[PDB]
Amino acid sequence: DIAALVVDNGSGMCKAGFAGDDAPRAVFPSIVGRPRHQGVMVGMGQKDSYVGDEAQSKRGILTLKYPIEHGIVTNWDDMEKIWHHTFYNELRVAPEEHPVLLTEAPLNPKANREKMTQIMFETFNTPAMYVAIQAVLSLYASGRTTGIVMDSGDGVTHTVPIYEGYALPHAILRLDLAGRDLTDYLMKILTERGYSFTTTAEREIVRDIKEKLCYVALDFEQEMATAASSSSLEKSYELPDGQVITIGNERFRCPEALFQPSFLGMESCGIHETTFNSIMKCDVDIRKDLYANTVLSGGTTMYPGIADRMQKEITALAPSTMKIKIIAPPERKYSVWIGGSILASLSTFQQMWISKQEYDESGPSIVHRKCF
Amino acid sequence: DIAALVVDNGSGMCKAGFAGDDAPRAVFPSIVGRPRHQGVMVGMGQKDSYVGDEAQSKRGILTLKYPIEHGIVTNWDDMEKIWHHTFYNELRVAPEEHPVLLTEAPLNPKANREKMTQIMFETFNTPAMYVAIQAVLSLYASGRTTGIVMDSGDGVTHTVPIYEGYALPHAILRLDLAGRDLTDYLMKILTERGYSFTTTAEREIVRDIKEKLCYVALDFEQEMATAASSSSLEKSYELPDGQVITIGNERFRCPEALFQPSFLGMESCGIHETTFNSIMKCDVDIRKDLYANTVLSGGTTMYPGIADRMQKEITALAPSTMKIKIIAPPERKYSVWIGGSILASLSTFQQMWISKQEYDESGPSIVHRKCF
Amino acid sequence: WXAXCPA
Amino acid sequence: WXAXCPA
Amino acid sequence: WXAXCPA
Amino acid sequence: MPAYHSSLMDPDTKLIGNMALLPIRSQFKGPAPRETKDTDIVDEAIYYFKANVFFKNYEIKNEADRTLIYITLYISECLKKLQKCNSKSQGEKEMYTLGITNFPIPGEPGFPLNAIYAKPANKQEDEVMRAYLQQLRQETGLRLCEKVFDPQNDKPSKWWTCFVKRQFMNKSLSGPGQ
Ligand SMILES: Nc1ncnc2c1ncn2[C@@H]1O[C@H](COP(=O)(O)OP(=O)(O)O)[C@@H](O)[C@H]1O
Ligand SMILES: Nc1ncnc2c1ncn2[C@@H]1O[C@H](COP(=O)(O)OP(=O)(O)O)[C@@H](O)[C@H]1O
Ligand SMILES: [Mg+2]
Ligand SMILES: [Mg+2]
């Protein structure tokens, strides 16, 4: 057996570890900081780019930039910085001795995975790598070979239906709507109360407010009429400088955008209707088995009371005789990584690597042949 | 290695010494005295003008002018004379063998810096020189690498925040209320008691009265009511001619003007509101450390009870959750100069000196590039 | 404003 | 992205 | 100063 | 075939720890004597660097070899910082402020070769070794800033910044790959 690094490195937060464990060894936000003021105190040591948790702690004087947006790498230098910090600082392991199992969302541009392979082979000199689809790993982590995975990360949402292992590639529905859009929408709607977060350092504060207070309402209109007729839903959060703010109606208005993107000015259907459409695109003989094996993942599906909402919404769209099960495990946020460690620890997986030798003779165009 | 000269050169008093020590070598009132009478006896010595301690010694037959006012040099001949007396008489060292680290308050006319470096390079022919902000030097001397420095010298007051060594020039605040204005206010309020000080010679007497008997009231109106109720705050000062005066109510009415400039007919806010506005102009993620690391300096912050008064005021202004601390080292009167030494003694500083070559190449306008 | 910026 | 959406 | 205030 | 070792060890050469305190032709302060011959240990190290990085076995024969090993390890740190610059007048400042930066010495965490380097025995030897290594660093950076930068475009020539990935026996004075 061999130890193979599993680096999820989805948008939002990079989670890297070793294959064979039950939790990623190092999880840190994938951001890169740059100082935006003069240095005046010489002799204390300075750096020109902070990465990960260090960039988060010093966010007061930095311009946080995400290298990945909507599941696509848009700045490769910062991506290389993130990978270097993951390899040599978080895991503290030599990357030229271990295989690497990276993940990519479905229906992304091929140049993305091509440049990913080129970077991982020509910069870090990994002896072998493999680019897997996130939802397939999420299904691995759930310990079943049939079901529709509904993975809603921080920058992209997508559903993949699989039956007996034979994934249907013609019913994979992708939707560029995830935690970052919800964070921006919360930043927008927080003004009407009276609070204004406008700089990229305060977007982190808004994200913390979202992931600590926001939740999904089972019946949107009833909850609106309730929180608009009584002060029993307002919650108070303390900013990092002593100020306290109180949010009421906004609490469930942020995640509700997932179920009706008309708030964000988008035309696409909600995530529930997206999952239902993905199911309905499959053949008629497997739908009943998909309905009872719906799986959630990603940290955007960690909103309190989203499983019940998804069940109540799909049950309204599916025939009255199909049983709808929303298999949402309480370890959903790390599921995409957990399935990876399961995969990279298998025996036959050693025959699915992209060996460094195989790349040295064929360039980056080999990932489209060795990895679907 | 050769020592480096550190000349604080603040308005009011000039502190000069060698880089590396723990205290200034020569400290003398930065005044220039010229006689206003004609000598009638020959052979006792008649000099055109005295400078420094000699002027204070013979203040009777002299008129005293300050070269620096509100941190700005307004008379360059007397300033060159001060620097000459500093180099040749007070330090007993030539300028052509030592770099010079001058200090100057922020938000000054750039012509001041230009003429300073021009005089230091063309007249004295120094090998190199540097110009530093006084608050940054105070922060150096305080051993910290983060915090807000509230400096209040004889001529100018300024607050400068720094976080992790990154000064924020967009939140640096300058207020022209300082020691000399308080001395004039004392000369004005002493009239009610009947004591009339008009000449520039007696202004030094008034200054000594101030810095020996004044003290900051923790609660102003309560101290006023107390002084009105009983005579238990009155103190007696012994004039240098043999008279005695009693002051009980002006002792705190003089420094109180720092917190209520309306006494002097100014519209600006007090020093506590100035520091609070300086803090609130910084980003929300760094205000806590600025609250917990407030640092005082300068001579005008040597009044008894100023630290407690500022702490109470800022605590009344800041949110109740934040923790406030007013670091007031007992050597703050010289703190700025201390930092100067700590700046020039570093081994990572010998690249930031303005070399004579650079000056000859780029004119006096180089100080705006090679200095912050 | 109440939080963020002054107004 | 290159066309449609930013990325 | 030159304009505003003396210095 | 063996790598390129230094041929400057002399029976009267003094030792610091177990490194030959070899004289150096420089202007910076330090405890090493001044050199009159046209080749010191730093010139020899810069001469042998480009070839010593490809070898993968290096037998320490004397103490001059340990000094040359240190300087070969430090040229790899100078190259990392010179790769980013774009003007020799900035490369010189970068090399000065790097030579000033204190690197680990034998017998401290972070030094890659504690096993094969005798740490100082007392405080005086510690101070002398610190000063000697600092002088070596400063002069090596000074000499290398004139090799890396070619006068045709006054920016780091690609014939020297291609050795940034090449590590001398995969060791380095900085962190493990950082
Ligand atoms: N327990 C939670 N409750 C509510 N929201 C959460 C929770 N955990 C994460 N989120 C939000 O979901 C967003 C995206 O999830 P994330 O797991 O970061 O995506 P990815 O897996 O691609 O990194 C985050 O910005 C976060 O604010
Ligand atoms: N013990 C004291 N109490 C109050 N004020 C003082 C005291 N000592 C000095 N001062 C005042 O400090 C002012 C100048 O001090 P200093 O910090 O040297 O300022 P500058 O740097 O402008 O010369 C003078 O106006 C003097 O009156
Ligand atoms: Mg995910
Ligand atoms: Mg001063």
PDB file of N, CA, C and O in Angstrom, chain F residues 16 120-130:
ATOM      1  N   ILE F  16      36.665  27.046  13.398  1.00  0.00           N
ATOM      2  CA  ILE F  16      35.556  27.578  14.182  1.00  0.00           C
ATOM      3  C   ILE F  16      34.518  26.468  14.254  1.00  0.00           C
ATOM      4  O   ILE F  16      33.952  26.065  13.232  1.00  0.00           O
ATOM      5  N   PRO F 120      29.024  25.025  18.442  1.00  0.00           N
ATOM      6  CA  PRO F 120      29.996  25.715  19.299  1.00  0.00           C
ATOM      7  C   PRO F 120      30.060  25.130  20.701  1.00  0.00           C
ATOM      8  O   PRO F 120      29.074  24.587  21.203  1.00  0.00           O
ATOM      9  N   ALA F 121      31.224  25.237  21.340  1.00  0.00           N
ATOM     10  CA  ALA F 121      31.428  24.675  22.669  1.00  0.00           C
ATOM     11  C   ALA F 121      31.101  25.650  23.788  1.00  0.00           C
ATOM     12  O   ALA F 121      30.831  25.213  24.911  1.00  0.00           O
ATOM     13  N   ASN F 122      31.125  26.951  23.515  1.00  0.00           N
ATOM     14  CA  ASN F 122      30.843  27.961  24.524  1.00  0.00           C
ATOM     15  C   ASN F 122      30.190  29.159  23.842  1.00  0.00           C
ATOM     16  O   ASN F 122      29.743  29.078  22.695  1.00  0.00           O
ATOM     17  N   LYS F 123      30.138  30.278  24.563  1.00  0.00           N
ATOM     18  CA  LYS F 123      29.456  31.461  24.040  1.00  0.00           C
ATOM     19  C   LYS F 123      30.346  32.259  23.094  1.00  0.00           C
ATOM     20  O   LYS F 123      29.867  32.782  22.080  1.00  0.00           O
ATOM     21  N   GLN F 124      31.638  32.372  23.407  1.00  0.00           N
ATOM     22  CA  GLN F 124      32.544  33.131  22.548  1.00  0.00           C
ATOM     23  C   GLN F 124      32.644  32.506  21.160  1.00  0.00           C
ATOM     24  O   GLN F 124      32.584  33.211  20.146  1.00  0.00           O
ATOM     25  N   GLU F 125      32.813  31.182  21.103  1.00  0.00           N
ATOM     26  CA  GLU F 125      32.861  30.497  19.815  1.00  0.00           C
ATOM     27  C   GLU F 125      31.538  30.648  19.072  1.00  0.00           C
ATOM     28  O   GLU F 125      31.518  30.786  17.845  1.00  0.00           O
ATOM     29  N   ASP F 126      30.421  30.637  19.806  1.00  0.00           N
ATOM     30  CA  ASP F 126      29.118  30.884  19.196  1.00  0.00           C
ATOM     31  C   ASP F 126      29.084  32.247  18.513  1.00  0.00           C
ATOM     32  O   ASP F 126      28.665  32.367  17.356  1.00  0.00           O
ATOM     33  N   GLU F 127      29.532  33.290  19.222  1.00  0.00           N
ATOM     34  CA  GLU F 127      29.511  34.634  18.654  1.00  0.00           C
ATOM     35  C   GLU F 127      30.432  34.735  17.445  1.00  0.00           C
ATOM     36  O   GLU F 127      30.076  35.360  16.433  1.00  0.00           O
ATOM     37  N   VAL F 128      31.617  34.135  17.530  1.00  0.00           N
ATOM     38  CA  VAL F 128      32.557  34.192  16.412  1.00  0.00           C
ATOM     39  C   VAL F 128      31.981  33.479  15.198  1.00  0.00           C
ATOM     40  O   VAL F 128      32.112  33.952  14.064  1.00  0.00           O
ATOM     41  N   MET F 129      31.326  32.335  15.410  1.00  0.00           N
ATOM     42  CA  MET F 129      30.716  31.623  14.292  1.00  0.00           C
ATOM     43  C   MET F 129      29.587  32.433  13.676  1.00  0.00           C
ATOM     44  O   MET F 129      29.451  32.475  12.448  1.00  0.00           O
ATOM     45  N   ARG F 130      28.759  33.074  14.507  1.00  0.00           N
ATOM     46  CA  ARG F 130      27.700  33.928  13.981  1.00  0.00           C
ATOM     47  C   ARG F 130      28.273  35.025  13.098  1.00  0.00           C
ATOM     48  O   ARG F 130      27.811  35.238  11.966  1.00  0.00           O
TER      49      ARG F 130
END
